[PDB]
C-alpha cells in the first residue's frame, strides 16, 4: 500500500 491518505483508516476501526 503506497497510499498517503491511509491514515484515515483509524476512522473506520
Swiss-Prot record:
It is found in: Virion membrane; Host cell membrane; Host endosome membrane. It comes from the Viruses. It is a single-pass type I membrane protein. Acts as a class I viral fusion protein. Under the current model, the protein has at least 3 conformational states: pre-fusion native state, pre-hairpin intermediate state, and post-fusion hairpin state. During fusion of viral and target intracellular membranes, the coiled coil regions (heptad repeats) assume a trimer-of-hairpins structure, positioning the fusion peptide in close proximity to the C-terminal region of the ectodomain. The formation of this structure appears to drive apposition and subsequent fusion of viral and target cell membranes. The mature envelope protein (Env) consists of a homotrimer of non-covalently associated gp120-gp41 heterodimers. The resulting complex protrudes from the virus surface as a spike. There seems to be as few as 10 spikes on the average virion. This is Transmembrane protein gp41. The gene is env. The chain holds residues 659 to 671 of 856 of the full protein.
